[PDB]
Design a protein around this nucleic acid. Structure first.
Lengths: 61, 98, 151, 79, 127, 114
RNA sequence: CCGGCCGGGAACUCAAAGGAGACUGCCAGUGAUAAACUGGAGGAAGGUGGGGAUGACGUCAAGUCAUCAUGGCCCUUACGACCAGGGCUACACACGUGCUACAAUGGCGCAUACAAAGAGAAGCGACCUCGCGAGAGCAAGCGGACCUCAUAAAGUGCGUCGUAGUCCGGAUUGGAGUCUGCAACUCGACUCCAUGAAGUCGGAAUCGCUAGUAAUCGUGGAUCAGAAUGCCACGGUGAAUAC
RNA sequence: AAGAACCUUACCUGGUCUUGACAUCCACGGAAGUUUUCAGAGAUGAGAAUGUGCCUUCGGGAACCGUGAGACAGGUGCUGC
């Protein structure tokens, strides 16, 4: 380690990637979030079935 | 040489853009390789349906990512610009590198 | 089952040795999809059987199996009073199935070494007709006909 | 032991510690932080380390260089 | 001249070629026997050179990729029976009786939600 | 022989004999036998006495046996008298390394109690 | 430089665009002649081809006011809002659902070898060097049929161990380390050395499965600072029995 | 619940605020903002620095901040019978 530099922890601790949750962008839910749409699963489904999301469809593989 | 790798939701759509690059190229100059097919990317998802509980049944989703690659080995530099730009590329994304 | 018929594929004959019967025996013996360790076991057991007995290859396990093939099996059944055990005459295919079937469980139960040796030893005391496979065969003949006419 | 090439200590508490080191021991200091890893300079000094509802009285001694503040504090009551 | 036969089993691509001659077995420019052919598809792939004729009448060149042991074998197996046609494919009629003119269609069944494997169902408390 | 340790590791092959002593496991057994120049396969008792006397010098180098026992016991008792939680977790007889106790403390807690 | 490597061939593989074929149709027999059925033919695929998608009218005034919306009710200087530490991970217990064992078809050591599907820019990070290893420093290439994670394991060839709480097995615990982050303290993962409990195959009872399935061994993803024996996905090996 | 070390997190013991964390709306003053400090566990209160900008009609106004006012905001509170 080194001198005064390690002691510089006067930061807000809102800097850290440990801090922000990644809540659902529409509803604030902090569970069920896939990053690709950035939404929790239910609003993904609600949108997708109503045909708005481009190029998205059912899978039968 | 100069090449276009395309990307599309519809296979029958990227098909029309790679039709248009061919018939544009042999019109304006020459020397196009047409659509090299290239393997399909398939973004397969599965997510839980219910608002609450009920883990058991879930719904699967897919986004088919169709690629195409077109190259021009064309040395006719002053008709390459005429081949360039003017196309709208069937309303779906295209990238044109040297 | 009740309605539609079942009649499966007739499996591969064993390479070089030429016994499709012994191919079925390794498929019964097979532990956890390891057909490779099964085929590794069988030839080592067959050489050690034929080496011990002084006999030829194909008929060594076949004569050992032949004593331990009964002509009947029993079924649990009821119509009136509380459960009966009912003897029935075995299918000739299922006869050779049952002889092989009891062998693998018997070979697990022995005091012996590793599997090539212990299986050859089980075949040895069925060829000599005095071990565990003949004891399992020499049961059903006593039990039959105390219970003959139920279906 | 663990936690790589050197541990962390709390800045606001360190200025209070320099008063405790220079002036000598007085009383248990009431500290919200548990986080600091002890090193020789905290030895011989009364401090008090939170358990989530009270500061627990730790007087520091010789081998406590191996330890954090938090370790002596009980956060779960039992029978 | 050359007699070609392709075939697949379980996503294994093969390419078989045949000409007359006292052939050794050549796979990916090494012998199948030097690919452990005592074990690797050991008599399995030489099925047309069993039933309808002997081995030592055709030279053979094979290039295979994918699968494991049984995965590697069936693509070559169905390519080699099809490539058996030095003077016409009349021997496919006899091999039709044996069944080796038809590759095994079967593939792995997918995983689906709520199953441990592919038909294996979990256990569940009471009933 | 006892090989300067107090255990006698009779009629084993040498790697097994060296693991049998307290304070030496499979890794340290490999390093000690490689240091002494002694082959793992050979039966330990059978080998010539000067090659034993070599091992008798070598095993003494690392700290082993009851010496290593009392050192460990002293650090435990010392930490336990500090009144640290991880210390007190020794005295209370329950999982030190943070394992769950709602279920599954059954090794360290011990047999089921009425 | 005899390495698909470099011309070249694009044959052929694969890929992905477009298509064909199988319809009880071909024949025979049986069957109320009709419907239908059995058997065979030919054929790569035959009697709903296999899988998946696709869930009738309605049931439990089912579940969900904590995803969201919302009738009505209530608090609105507190049941709101902000912030630090703590708790959600406790423990005489009981149960569910999983993982790993009790081994010799196996352990342990060396050599040897075929995959399939993924993901990646505040990413993945070769290679190269350094470290006991975990890892560390320097650092190409690629927004991907290319480059990277990434060197698939069971398997196979030789050798050792030989029935033992073991060269089985790993709990627990000690010491000494690495990695992320404002932070490893209650409350992380991971490495190294050492320790080597229980367990030598589980009562009554009970669950799953009819073919690439059961079983068994690996790999991958989403979630993600760091977080897996879970879940979700992929393939390797691969059955038994259905009167 | 497709990820409880803080955050997440709702709850507790503690520290605080009450037109507020967030909307819609007026007035009044201040560019927004980039630097640094003491006291505090931090939130924070309490500072010194500096900066003082695009439209303008010379009362300005839009971007945006701080203070105050009252209409109000808020609730993972309650009621799935």
């Amino acid at each position: 380690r080194w001198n005064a530099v390690l002691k510089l922890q006067t930061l807000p601790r809102d800097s850290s990637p440990s801090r922000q949750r990644n809540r659902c962008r529409q509803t604030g839910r902090p569970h069920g979030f896939l990053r690709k749409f950035g939404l929790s699963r239910i609003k993904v489904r609600e949108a997708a079935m109503r045909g708005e999301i481009p190029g998205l469809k059912k899978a039968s593989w | 040489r100069i090449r276009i790798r395309l990307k599309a939701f519809d296979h029958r759509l990227i098909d029309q853009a790679t039709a248009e690059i061919v018939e544009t190229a042999k019109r304006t100059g020459a020397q196009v390789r047409g659509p090299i097919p290239l393997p399909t990317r398939k973004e397969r998802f599965t997510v839980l349906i219910s608002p609450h509980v009920n883990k058991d049944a879930r719904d699967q989703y897919e986004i088919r990512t169709h690629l195409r690659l077109v190259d021009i080995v064309e040395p006719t530099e002053k008709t390459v610009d005429a081949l360039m730009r003017l196309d709208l590329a069937a309303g779906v994304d295209v990238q044109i590198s040297l | 089952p009740r309605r539609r018929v079942i009649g499966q594929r007739k499996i591969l004959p064993d390479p070089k040795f030429g016994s499709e019967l012994l191919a079925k025996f390794v498929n019964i013996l097979m532990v956890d999809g390891k057909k490779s360790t099964a085929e590794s076991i069988v030839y080592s057991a067959l050489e050690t059987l034929a080496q011990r007995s002084g006999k030829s290859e194909l008929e060594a396990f076949e004569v050992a199996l032949e004593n331990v093939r009964p002509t009947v099996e029993v079924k649990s059944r009821r119509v009136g009073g509380s459960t009966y055990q009912v003897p029935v005459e075995v299918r000739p295919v299922r006869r050779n199935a049952l002889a092989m079937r009891w062998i693998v469980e018997a070979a697990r139960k022995r005091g012996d070494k590793s599997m090539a040796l212990r299986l050859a030893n089980e075949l040895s005391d069925a060829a000599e007709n005095k071990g565990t496979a003949v004891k399992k065969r020499e049961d059903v003949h006593r039990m039959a006909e105390a219970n003959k006419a139920f279906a | 032991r663990s936690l790589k090439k050197g541990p962390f200590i709390d800045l606001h508490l360190l200025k209070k510690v320099e008063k405790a080191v220079e002036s000598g021991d007085k009383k248990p200091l009431r500290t919200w932080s548990r986080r600091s890893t002890i090193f020789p300079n905290m030895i011989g000094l009364t401090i008090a380390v939170h358990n989530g509802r009270q500061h627990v009285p730790v007087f520091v001694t010789d081998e406590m260089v191996g330890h954090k503040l938090g370790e002596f504090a009980p956060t779960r009551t039992y029978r | 001249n050359q007699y070609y036969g392709t075939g697949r089993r379980k996503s294994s691509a093969a390419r078989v070629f045949i000409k007359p001659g006292n052939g050794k077995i050549v796979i990916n420019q090494r012998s199948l026997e030097q690919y452990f052919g005592r074990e690797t598809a050991r008599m399995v792939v030489r099925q047309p050179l069993e039933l309808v004729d002997m081995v030592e009448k055709l030279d053979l060149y094979i290039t295979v990729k994918g699968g494991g042991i049984s995965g590697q074998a069936g693509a070559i197996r169905h390519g080699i029976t099809r490539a058996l046609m030095e003077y016409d494919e009349s021997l496919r009629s006899e091999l039709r009786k044996a069944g080796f003119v038809t590759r095994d269609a079967r593939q792995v069944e997918r995983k689906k939600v709520g199953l441990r494997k592919a038909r294996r169902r979990p256990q569940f408390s009471k009933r | 022989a006892r090989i300067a340790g107090i255990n006698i590791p009779d009629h084993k092959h040498a790697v097994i004999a060296l693991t049998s002593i307290y304070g030496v496991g499979k890794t340290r057994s490999k390093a000690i036998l490689a240091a002494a120049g002694i082959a793992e396969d050979v039966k330990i008792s059978e080998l010539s006495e000067g090659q034993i006397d070599t091992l008798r010098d070598e095993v003494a180098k690392f700290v082993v046996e009851g010496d290593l026992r009392r050192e460990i016991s002293m650090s435990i008792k010392r930490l336990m008298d500090l009144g640290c939680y991880r210390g007190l977790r020794h005295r209370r007889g329950l999982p030190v390394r943070g394992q769950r106790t709602k279920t599954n403390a059954r090794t360290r807690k011990g047999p089921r109690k009425p």
